Chain A
Amino acid sequence: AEIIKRTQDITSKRLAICQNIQFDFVKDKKYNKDALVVKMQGFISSRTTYSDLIKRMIWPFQYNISLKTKDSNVDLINYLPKNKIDSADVSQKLGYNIGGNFQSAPSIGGSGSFNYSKTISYNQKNYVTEVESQNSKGVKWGVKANSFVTPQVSAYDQYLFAQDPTGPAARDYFVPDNQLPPLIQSGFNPSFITTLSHEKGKGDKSEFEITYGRNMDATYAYVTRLAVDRKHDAFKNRNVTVKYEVNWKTHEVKIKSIT
């Protein structure tokens, strides 16, 4: 039993997104298939802007992460997080024991010992994670605005973030930085896992796609008294997709394209 580790780092300059991926081959003689444990990290910038058209704050309502394949060479066999989760701290662990045995735990502390393991950890304060689709060929998570703490407000409140304007500039119509959470003010550091299994000998190469991005909402404030509207799903799927080719025979992972 051994682990062959690779990494891929790719940046989309246009989107201000980084995919830092880890690809671990579990090469195990007591195991029927090849497995590739894919850990998805990097950064997805909030790209929160304050402009005039009436001030506008564009802001990330949801962060998107998915991995999908179209080949019949390859299936997803696990993914983490597996279930919806609402705590600010998301820390989980996948484990593998010789013999093709994978388990996962919804924690890191107190999660037991394995021949091999890989953890995830991210912060999502005011947001919540949903596993919008898992099939044998793909999984998609959404990290979705949930509720905000005020000097307490749903993510669907139209007046969220608007302010009796502190000045004439657009930014002065919206609450200060020390009132916004990292996922609005800075962006999201993702930490996700999926395992890819491939029946040994059933083709040397397989292909799959990892996508990172965001769905922006838009808030519009102006004094006519402050009035505030809100466009949900203003700019949806601001995303980058990176296609990878895995070579099972040589335990390699290549980039094919970045859109």
Chain B
Amino acid sequence: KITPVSVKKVDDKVTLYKTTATADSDKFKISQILTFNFIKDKSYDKDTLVLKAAGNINSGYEKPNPNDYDFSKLYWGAKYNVSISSQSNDSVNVVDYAPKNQNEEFQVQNTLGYTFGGDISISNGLTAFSETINYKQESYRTTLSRCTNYKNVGWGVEAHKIMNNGWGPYGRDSFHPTYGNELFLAGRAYAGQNFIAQHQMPLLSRSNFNPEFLSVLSHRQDGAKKSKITVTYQREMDLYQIRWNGFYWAGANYKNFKTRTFKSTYEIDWENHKVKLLDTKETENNK
């Protein structure tokens, strides 16, 4: 689903065209809610698109059977990747975005502002147009992809310091020589009842991530009127296992044992400030 364009004349010189497009994968429990803000600026001969990427990405977590006796496992949402990408020989660049710096605050919050004549400023916290991002990521860290460039921006939102009661912090690769990975281990019952209480797991590991990310695409008004972009939401599911060995409970964490990847493709009509869904692509890996 795609809203019609709504139009806000900010003054004689700036018009905003907004459309919100929604693309869902019911199979993966991912829902992309994209808000496209075209900024028409009569003093600047580039189109500006502020694209806000929101919605939700299910963690992939399911509660274990409480009757698992000697051995039990859970999958959890250990990393979320978002990318917004342009094409190599179109004349559209990714010129700015938010967030930009590595960030482990409980809430990521940024404000983007567009200044008349075409300048973008990004600041911390909640100009002719403004937009904000705000997302909770407790126990996770957001890192800008090292492969961000003029055709592509990406972020990884990844398990960083997970506290287990007053124990930890644990991560995806924690290893104790005896207990293995203790991330979600209650006590060193049935295996199925020896994971820590769900409410003590980070919300991103057991429920949904609600991403909010901004990017700024600049389009030259010479050459083509239309271009394509893609937006990818992805989860890495880690397999977290607990096992009685004879003497004690030990845990093991296998990174990215399942991957789920939803890519949508949109045609951008820069002359008319409209977008059209061209494609959705669900891929999965299962180690």
Instruction: Indicate which residue in A91, A186, A254 contacts B149 across the interface (CB closer than 8 Å).
Output: A186
Q: How far is the CB of A195 from chain B (nearest CB, A)?
A: 19
Q: B149, A189: Cβ atoms under 8 Å?
A: yes
User: Interface 1/0s, chain A 1-37, versus B by CB < 8 A?
Assistant: 0000111110101001110000000000000000000
User: Which chain B residue lies CB-closest to A5?
Assistant: B283
Q: A91, B283: Cβ atoms under 8 Å?
A: no
Q: How far is the CB of A3 from chain B (nearest CB, A)?
A: 11
- Write out the residue numbers on chain A whose beta carbons fall within 8 Å of the beta carbon of B281: 5
- Write out the residue numbers on chain A whose beta carbons fall within 8 Å of the beta carbon of B145: 11, 18
Q: A42, B147: Cβ atoms under 8 Å?
A: yes
| Chain B residues numbered 201-238 whose CB sits less than 8 Å from any CB in chain A | 234
- Write out the residue numbers on chain B whose beta carbons fall within 8 Å of the beta carbon of A18: 145-147
Is A182 on the interface with B (CB-CB < 8 A)? yes
- Which B positions have Cβ atoms within 8 angstroms of A? 81, 87-89, 145-147, 149-152, 234, 261, 281, 283, 285-287
Total interface residues in chain A, CB < 8 Å? 26
- Write out the residue numbers on chain A whose beta carbons fall within 8 Å of the beta carbon of B234: 9
- Write out the residue numbers on chain B whose beta carbons fall within 8 Å of the beta carbon of A213: none
- Which A positions have Cβ atoms within 8 angstroms of B? 5-9, 11, 13, 16-18, 42-43, 45, 89, 91, 121-123, 182, 186-187, 189, 191, 252-254
- Write out the residue numbers on chain B whose beta carbons fall within 8 Å of the beta carbon of A11: 145-147
Q: B283, A7: Cβ atoms under 8 Å?
A: yes
Q: A6, B285: Cβ atoms under 8 Å?
A: yes
Q: How far is the CA of A21 from the CA of B89 in the complex (A)?
A: 19
Given A5-B283, A7-B261, A8-B285, does the pair A123, B149 have CB atoms closer than 8 Å?
A: no
Q: How far is the CB of B147 from chain A (nearest CB, A)?
A: 4
Q: How far is the CA of A6 from the CA of B149 in the complex (A)?
A: 24
Q: How far is the CA of A191 from the CA of B85 in the complex (A)?
A: 14
Q: A189, B151: Cβ atoms under 8 Å?
A: yes
Q: How far is the CB of A10 from chain B (nearest CB, A)?
A: 10
Q: How far is the CA of A73 from the CA of B6 in the complex (A)?
A: 57
Interface SS majority for chain B: loop
Q: B147, A6: Cβ atoms under 8 Å?
A: no
Q: A45, B87: Cβ atoms under 8 Å?
A: no
- Write out the residue numbers on chain A whose beta carbons fall within 8 Å of the beta carbon of B149: 43, 182, 186-187, 189
User: Which chain B residue lies CB-closest to A188?
Assistant: B149
- Write out the residue numbers on chain B whose beta carbons fall within 8 Å of the beta carbon of A254: 285, 287
Instruction: Indicate which residue in A5, A42, A121, A186 contacts B150 across the interface (CB closer than 8 Å).
Output: A186
Q: A123, B287: Cβ atoms under 8 Å?
A: no
- Write out the residue numbers on chain B whose beta carbons fall within 8 Å of the beta carbon of A8: 285
- Write out the residue numbers on chain B whose beta carbons fall within 8 Å of the beta carbon of A123: 88-89
Q: A121, B147: Cβ atoms under 8 Å?
A: no
User: Which chain B residue lies CB-closest to A10?
Assistant: B256
Q: How far is the CA of A139 from the CA of B112 in the complex (A)?
A: 45
Given A91-B89, A123-B89, does the pair A13, B285 have CB atoms closer than 8 Å?
A: no
Q: A45, B88: Cβ atoms under 8 Å?
A: no
Q: How far is the CA of A17 from the CA of B286 in the complex (A)?
A: 24
Instruction: Indicate which residue in B146, B150, B152, B283 contacts A45 across the interface (CB closer than 8 Å).
Output: B146
- Write out the residue numbers on chain A whose beta carbons fall within 8 Å of the beta carbon of B285: 6-8, 252-254
Q: A121, B152: Cβ atoms under 8 Å?
A: no
Q: How far is the CB of A130 from chain B (nearest CB, A)?
A: 19
Q: B261, A182: Cβ atoms under 8 Å?
A: no
Q: B150, A182: Cβ atoms under 8 Å?
A: yes
- Write out the residue numbers on chain B whose beta carbons fall within 8 Å of the beta carbon of A191: 88
- Write out the residue numbers on chain B whose beta carbons fall within 8 Å of the beta carbon of A253: 285
Instruction: Indicate which residue in B89, B146, B261, B286 contacts A121 across the interface (CB closer than 8 Å).
Output: B89
Q: A89, B147: Cβ atoms under 8 Å?
A: no
A-B contact pairs, 22 of them (CB 8 A): A6-B283, A6-B285, A7-B285, A8-B285, A11-B145, A16-B146, A17-B147, A18-B145, A18-B147, A43-B152, A89-B89, A121-B88, A121-B89, A122-B89, A123-B89, A186-B150, A189-B88, A191-B88, A252-B285, A252-B286, A253-B285, A254-B287
